[PDB]
Amino acid sequence: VRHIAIPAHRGLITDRNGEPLAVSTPVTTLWANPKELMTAKERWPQLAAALGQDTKLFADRIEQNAEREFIYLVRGLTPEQGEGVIALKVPGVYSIEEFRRFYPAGEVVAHAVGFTDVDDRGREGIELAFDEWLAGVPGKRQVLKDRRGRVIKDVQVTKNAKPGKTLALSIDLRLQYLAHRELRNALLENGAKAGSLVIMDVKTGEILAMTNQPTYNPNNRRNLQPAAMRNRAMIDVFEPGSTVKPFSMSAALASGRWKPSDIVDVYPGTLQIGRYTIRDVSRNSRQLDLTGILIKSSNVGISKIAFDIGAESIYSVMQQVGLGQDTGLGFPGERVGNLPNHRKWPKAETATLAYGYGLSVTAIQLAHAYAALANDGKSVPLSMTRVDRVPDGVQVISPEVASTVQGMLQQVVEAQGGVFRAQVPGYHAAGKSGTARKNAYRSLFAGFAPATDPRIAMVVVIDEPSKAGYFGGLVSAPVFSKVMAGALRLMNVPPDNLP
Ligand SMILES: *C(=O)[C@H](CO/N=C(\CCC(=O)O)C(=O)O)NC(=O)/C(=N\OCc1cc(=O)c(O)cn1O)c1csc(N)n1
């Protein structure tokens, strides 16, 4: 080794507004030439103490490595701590300017921003996904070692350590803080195991917030269990249940055979498909219109519509909105989930698909799907980075069918017997709850607002609420209301519910 690489300054990660999220902070690494340290043995106890180390263990280490010309003493200390060891004037001890990451928002954006390893290389989240952009390239400086390893002179500074590039995230730190606090509070109040909350800008494909509970302080990574490190919104796959019925309804409305005032008979709240029985959660209905099917979350109702239209039209919509499909985000450990397909769709698979059983999705897929519906049936590619020029997007559902589904979803939140807990102060809000049985449950609420001209889509996933109430509308809906209210206010969205 006659040439050494100067660690590059890792690029700044900021939120959409330039609020710092990952900052490269100067640190100092101490290394030694054992052949030189072996000539200053009386100095070892002073040095042993200065680096923390036990006196005899430190000496054993230098005696074993006595023939080597380089070893690390201690990596990434505070510059002043490094200074304090250099000030001892121990022959063979040399310093290196190094970089370590500091995460100002800490636990609030841990899962999204991720973290770097010992070597300042991206390991998790955005740190890894954008490692090439962030890392830059180290620089080579020529050194002059006589023979014993003693540095005489820096001959030629050929290549300079090119710093990493800045990266602005789509995340709004104000919305992220609001989402994190409200999800944390919901978990406490419901005695929940875990939770996820995703906020999307419907017009840009931007992830405005992505929070998971439990979270970790990335700055104090020691002791940590992977349960708090899981980026659940992108990794945890679940059956979306009744939250996918608006998509089955979109295929119904696009077929030409269905209108919202159409009536379905769901009595007695059960439907036998030979060996299999479709069962409604509440079984006190007979005739329901299409909005009623969504309000009462009738699996029987949607299965009957599904038999009429075919599972092919339902599969298509779900697939086009991104459920069980690649998000193109390239995040570490990102699960794609599953949208089963068939040549010939059997009656049982048709029903289960219509009501969200069998298929598995991520919180991120569900939010993106709701964003397409909120964005007048137009799907915009997902983004974790600030979007300056909006991509063209794909018309996945017709503007008219999307507008009708929106009105129905507004009625799911507003109408008698609906999800009144999702209601947003001064705005019309639209959405659908879900309760997936795992005897444990996953509480879901997906929606968007203002129901008039939608701006933001939101998915709230509450994993295992241990209180008497577990339905998505009891558990996840009040979280949506609070976070949606705060987000509409922060983005200065005009109210649509005035006289
Ligand atoms: C939608 O998510 C449905 C219906 O329940 N949804 C509710 C409950 C509130 C209410 O309407 O009274 C909501 O909107 O919050 N979810 C289910 O049907 C699921 N589980 O419930 C039990 C169940 C499961 C099942 O497979 C079945 O055929 C019948 N029942 O009763 C569910 C759907 S996917 C999954 N893992 N669970």
Which resolution, in Å, applies to this structure?
2.3
Burial class (CB in 10 A: 0-12, 13-18, 19+), 97: middle
Boundaries of every domain in the chain: 1-170, 171-217+413-499, 231-412
Rounded to a whole number of angstroms, the CA Rg of the chain reads 29
| Ligand 1 atom having least distance to the Cα of 277 | 28
| Ligand 1 atom having least distance to the Cα of 474 | 15
**What's the 463 CA to ligand 1 centre distance in angstroms?**
15
| Ligand 1 atom having least distance to the Cα of 437 | 37
Q: Which residues are catalytic?
A: 242
Q: Which residues line ligand 1 (CB under 6 A)?
A: 239, 241-242, 278-279, 281-282, 296-297, 299, 356-357, 433-437, 471-473
- As a whole number of angstroms, the distance between CA 62 and CA 56 comes to 10
**What's the 432 CA to ligand 1 centre distance in angstroms?**
12
Measure CA of the first residue to CA of the last residue in the chain; give whole Å. Answer: 77
| Ligand 1 atom having least distance to the Cα of 438 | 36
Q: Does domain 171-217+413-499 have CATH number 3.30.450.330?
A: yes
Phi/psi for 263 (5° steps) reads -110, 140
Paired tokens of 249? 């309804």
Closest residue to atom 33 of ligand 1, CA basis: 241
Closest residue to atom 29 of ligand 1, CA basis: 279
DSSP string, 428-466: --EEEEEEEE---EEEEEEEEE-SSS--EEEEEEEE---
- As a whole number of angstroms, the distance between CA 20 and CA 169 comes to 10
CA 311 to chain centre: 31
**What's the 229 CA to ligand 1 centre distance in angstroms?**
29
Maximum Cα–Cα distance across the chain: 94
CA 342 to chain centre: 31
* CATH fold of the domain at 231-412: Beta-lactamase (3.40.710)
DSSP string, 319-366: HHTTTTS--S---TT----B----SS--HHHHHHHHTT-S-BB-HHHH
The DSSP 8-state label assigned to residue 39 in this structure reads T
**What's the 243 CA to ligand 1 centre distance in angstroms?**
10
Paired tokens of 191? 């005695």
Closest to 259 measured CA to CA, from 305, 195, 223: 305
Give the residue, out of 266, 275, 277, 281, with the most ligand 1 atoms within 8 A of its beta carbon, to mutate for a pocket test: 281
Q: Cβ neighbours of residue 439 under 8 Å, at least 6 residues apart? A: none
